[PDB]
Backbone:
RNA sequence: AACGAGGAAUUCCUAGUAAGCGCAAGUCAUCAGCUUGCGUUGAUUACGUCCCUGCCCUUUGUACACAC
């Protein structure tokens, strides 16, 4: 009583950017990441809590803040998830220094940490990372604020441990058919849930247990895929 | 410090 | 300029204020021009509403 | 019952003025097609700021509107829509390109939705201009969004801004030019279909202002 | 895709209605109301498009068994639409009704 | 103002000639019998006329619209307007 | 010169800087400001009523100021030149803006 | 002789010398009819002094207009200025006065820039 | 969601308000009695009609 | 290889103004890796308020009424 589509060859879903603003999708933003650049003299290095504790004492910023490892922990969590296969999220990086990094869903971020250290210090100077396939630019630093480059009909939330706990699948199902969720995630190891109070319209919780930044992504993503039937 | 006239009103 | 700033809801409280200070005449004659110069800049400026709201206590207040 | 004879000879000229122009001396029409009569601003509080009472031929009144504070209101809004079309460094100081777009745009709104183009443009600005806009507070270093109301001049100014930017951005890399996508805006903004640029972006500005008040 | 645009101007595709993924054979305009379009398809559904909204069909007119390759409107009734399948069986619809069944 | 010259024909027509050039400007047609008196008010706004058919027509003159129309009983021989108070008197045949 | 009608006396005699003739005059309805105009200078002098100093020399006319007058509603004043241009002034409260009408 | 009236029209740096004489009803711009003005969108910006007052009042007159200076637009604001001035200064001379105050009140309510040159002399703040 | 229009009576001077935001006593259009002290955002004068999504809140200072 | 409109920061800007465009001259300094003229097309947003950041003024009313 209903006919088929004409060609049933599966194709790649259209890869989202900041330029498209109509399509419904998820947005997972990592806020206040520790991605800072320091010079040694004979090269430039990413800042680490673990690799060099003594460098941060001279700079004055404490060791316990500057952790880039949690970011690469989340970037493998978001990109390998099937909602990054099916084309329904993009991910923005809000650095604690104010830098806003757009991440193309097509990139494959290197799963070793040390290559990622060399990947970030290529990013923070040249401002755009291009693939070796070289069809497009992949990690581009974009102009603040994030409220420009988010989609228009958006919903903006914050993961908070003090927020009332909700269920992921129930929350997405009450969105409209064109409204796009945006999840500002606190990647800070310890800090207040106030990094985006001027942005979002509510705060939502995920579990009664204190969570990592990595799981709170996948706690949201694997609820999202069941809420979108993937 | 409140601006005057307002501080009339809550007093 | 700081007496037109208030809503009309406080003016209805403001007339009940001066309704009480009429009872204590020592406050009255010790501050007689200032009470006079404040009602008659308010009830000029907030005339159309005080004349159009009906409340028999307000007649008993203003008398 | 009663007749006034004001014209006594068949007025013919040695220089031939065409058949569409001699007919145009009864009512003044925009681009010699569109009547300013029967054009009502269907939202009160926006009359005296959308000015469609004085009819005009083309949307090119070169008069001074910048000098007084509210002189900007009496600009006939068809011109006030063309003035916001030349907003880019590739486009500043080219009005005859913009007027040629609107005369090509107002044709499209007719062909799609017969009513009037100029009734749609007035009905577009009435819909997209927000009703409560949110402002930033000081608050001692912790800024929260404090919701206030908005003056009806700002309701027109930002309405015209969102339509032309919404047309200029949607026709960025498409075969559809500025002229057609703006007619895709104004028709959708007339219905408020939430599929235009400005009806969407108003519906955050009235959404955010409801959240914290 | 039915790509409706103005005649005497081949360079401006005014309105590009992405209809069904099956190939649309017949695209006509309504004789009575000049802004309602109706296309057919190889998808065996005829779609009455209102070209104010080129992104949604105003009504999905359906029930066809095999390969609608003609439809035509009737002068006395702007609501009534004659739609001919390829199986036989000329369908007659009332677009002001539910329409998914013929009359 | 001394710029317009009214003429009431004996076939209803009220031609209004200008007084610099003697040029024709407007021709009013309400009456069908002889017009027997015209006037214009002091403000140059409203205009009256009286016919032998009994119609006393009240014109606007800034716009060319007929304001109204009054009918008395008898035919009307003459009219004297008084521009200071906007009263005018008619002479009837009764 | 100002005058009283209760007491029949000058308050203050307002004068210019370089001793100019004054044709005409305009007085703020809220009696704070007295403006005057010349044939010699074509600058609109502006005196305050309390302090007899001239507050400001409003200028911008070619040719003399014929007359000057204030709104009684919002207290903008409007001058009347002989360079064929009305120029309407707005002199109160942080605006100081001018509009000529030829 | 021949009754004529000469009026000027001026925008940015463009003059407009409109001789108006009693004639048959031709209206020329630079030895070319007024239906052939260049910018082709602003042609109705110069039909304004024709169509505001009514095209009957051009039936007896000639409008010879010649323009120099300016650009494409700022000449069109000069021919609409000198036709309005050349029409309203022929009715005060050789036709009736009450025609003129009907015209001068007609061009005024539509656009006063037809008559007097809107001179955008500078202002220092 | 009915929307109540309001006409502006008097802009308020000398009130200490955050820049950009001005403070205005409006008058209800559908009933000419009431007044509510609301804040505007854009440029506003008297005798213009303003749009209120909510009537009963009455805006205070914004520091 | 660098390169798809340019990050954080940062400065200027209120009408014939921002900006787009070409033509010209080379005037005892200055400029030719450019400078200064001239004309054309020519807007958006304020034009309010001292809330913030600064700067400034006053804290005998003296000047003469009346008023405060």
Residues:
């Amino acid at each position: 009583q209903k006919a088929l589509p004409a060609s049933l060859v599966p194709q790649a879903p259209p890869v989202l950017t900041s330029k498209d603003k109509i399509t419904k999708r998820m947005i997972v933003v990592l806020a206040m990441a520790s991605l800072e650049t320091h010079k040694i003299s004979d090269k430039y290095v990413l800042l680490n809590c673990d690799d060099h504790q003594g460098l941060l004492k001279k700079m004055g910023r404490d060791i316990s803040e500057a952790r880039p490892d949690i970011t690469h922990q989340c970037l493998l969590t978001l990109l390998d998830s099937p909602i990054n296969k099916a084309g329904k999220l993009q991910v923005y990086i809000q650095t604690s220094r104010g830098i806003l990094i757009e991440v193309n869903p097509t990139v494959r971020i290197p799963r070793t940490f040390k290559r990622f250290s060399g990947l970030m210090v290529q990013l923070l100077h040249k401002l755009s990372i291009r693939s070796v396939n070289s069809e497009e630019k992949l990690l581009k630093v974009i102009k603040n604020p994030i409220t420009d480059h988010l989609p228009t009909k958006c919903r903006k939330v914050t993961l908070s441990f003090d927020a009332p706990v909700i269920r992921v699948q129930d929350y997405i199902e009450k969105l409209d058919d064109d409204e796009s969720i945006c999840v500002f995630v606190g990647a800070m190891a310890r800090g207040k849930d106030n990094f985006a109070d001027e942005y979002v319209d509510e705060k939502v919780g995920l579990s009664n247990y204190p969570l990592s930044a990595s799981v709170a992504c996948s706690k949201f993503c694997h609820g999202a895929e069941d809420a979108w039937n993937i | 410090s409140l601006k005057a006239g307002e501080r009339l009103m809550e007093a | 300029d700081a007496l037109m700033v208030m809503p009309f809801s406080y003016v209805l409280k403001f007339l009940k204020f001066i309704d009480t200070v009429m009872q204590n005449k020592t406050l009255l004659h010790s501050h007689l021009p200032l009470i006079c110069k404040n009602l008659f800049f308010i009830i000029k400026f907030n005339h159309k509403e005080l004349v159009s709201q009906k409340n028999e206590e307000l007649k008993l207040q203003i008398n | 019952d009663f007749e006034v004879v004001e014209e006594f000879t068949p007025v013919v000229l040695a220089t031939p003025i065409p058949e569409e122009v001699q007919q145009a001396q009864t009512e003044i029409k925009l681009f010699n097609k569109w009547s300013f009569e029967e054009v009502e601003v269907k939202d009160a509080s926006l009359v005296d700021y959308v000015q469609v009472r004085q009819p005009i031929f083309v949307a090119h009144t070169a008069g001074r509107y910048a000098n007084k504070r509210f002189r900007k209101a009496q600009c006939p809004i068809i011109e006030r829509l063309t003035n916001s079309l030349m907003m880019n460094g590739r486009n500043n100081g080219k009005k005859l390109k913009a007027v040629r777009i609107i005369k090509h745009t107002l044709d499209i709104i007719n062909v799609l939705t017969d009513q009037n183009p100029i009734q749609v443009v007035v009905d577009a600005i009435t819909n997209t201009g927000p009703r409560e806009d949110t402002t930033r507070v000081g608050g001692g270093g912790a800024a929260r969004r404090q919701a206030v109301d908005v003056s009806p001049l700002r309701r027109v100014n930002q309405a015209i801004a969102l339509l032309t930017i919404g047309a200029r951005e949607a026709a960025f890399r498409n075969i559809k030019t500025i002229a057609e996508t703006l007619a895709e805006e104004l028709i959708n903004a007339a219905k408020g279909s939430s599929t235009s640029y400005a009806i969407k972006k108003k519906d955050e500005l009235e959404r955010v202002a409801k959240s914290n008040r | 895709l039915v790509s409706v645009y103005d005649s005497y101007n081949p360079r401006t595709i005014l309105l590009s209605i992405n209809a069904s993924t099956h190939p649309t054979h017949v695209t006509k305009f309504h004789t009575q109301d000049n802004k309602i379009l109706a296309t057919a398809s190889d998808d065996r559904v005829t779609r009455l498009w209102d070209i104010s909204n080129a992104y949604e069909p105003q009504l999905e007119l359906t029930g066809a068994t095999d390969y609608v390759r003609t439809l035509s409107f009737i002068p006395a009734a702007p609501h009534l639409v004659a739609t001919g399948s390829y199986d036989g069986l000329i369908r007659l619809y009332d677009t002001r009704s539910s329409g998914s069944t013929p009359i | 103002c001394g710029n317009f010259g009214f003429i009431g024909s004996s076939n209803g027509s009220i031609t209004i000639y200008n007084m610099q050039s003697g040029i024709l400007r407007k021709k009013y047609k309400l009456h069908k019998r002889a017009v027997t008196g015209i006037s214009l008010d002091g403000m140059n706004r409203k205009m009256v006329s009286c016919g032998l058919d009994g119609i006393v027509g009240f014109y606007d003159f800034n716009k060319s619209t007929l304001l109204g129309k009054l009918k008395l009983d008898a035919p009307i021989t003459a009219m004297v307007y008084h521009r200071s108070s906007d009263l005018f008197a008619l002479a009837l045949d009764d | 010169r100002a005058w009283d009608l209760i007491r029949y006396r000058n308050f203050r005699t307002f004068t210019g800087t370089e001793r100019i003739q004054f044709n005409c005059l305009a007085v703020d309805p809220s009696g704070e400001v007295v403006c005057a105009g010349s044939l010699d200078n074509f600058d609109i002098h502006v005196w305050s009523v309390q302090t007899g100093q001239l507050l400001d020399a409003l200028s911008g006319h070619e040719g003399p100021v014929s007359c000057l007058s204030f709104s009684q509603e919002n207290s903008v004043l409007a001058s009347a030149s002989w360079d064929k241009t009305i120029r309407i002034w707005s002199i109160f409260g942080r605006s100081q803006q001018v509009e000529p009408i030829e | 002789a021949v009754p004529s009236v000469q009026t000027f029209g001026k925008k940015k740096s463009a003059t407009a010398v409109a001789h108006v004489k009693a004639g048959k009803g031709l209206i020329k711009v630079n030895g070319s009819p007024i239906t052939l003005v260049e910018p082709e969108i602003l042609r109705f910006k110069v039909y304004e002094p024709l169509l505001l007052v009514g095209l009957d009042k051009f039936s007896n007159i000639d409008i010879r207009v010649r323009v120099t200076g300016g650009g494409h637009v700022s000449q069109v604001y000069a021919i609409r200025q000198a036709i309005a001035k050349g029409l309203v200064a022929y009715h005060q001379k050789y036709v009736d006065e009450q025609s003129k105050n009907e015209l001068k009140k007609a061009f005024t309510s539509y656009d006063r820039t037809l008559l007097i040159a809107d001179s955008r002399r500078p202002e220092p703040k | 969601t009915p929307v109540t229009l309001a006409k502006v009576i008097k802009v308020l001077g000398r009130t200490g308000s955050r820049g950009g935001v001005t403070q205005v006593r409006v008058e209800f259009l559908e009933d000419t009695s009431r007044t509510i002290v609301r804040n505007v955002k854009g440029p506003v004068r008297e005798n213009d009609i303003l749009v209120l999504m909510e009537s009963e809140r009455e805006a205070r200072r914004l520091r």
Remarks:
- Residues 8-213 of chain D form a domain with the Ribosomal Protein S7 fold (CATH 1.10.455.10).
- The first helix of chain D runs from residue 19 to 22.
- Chain D has one domain: 8-213.
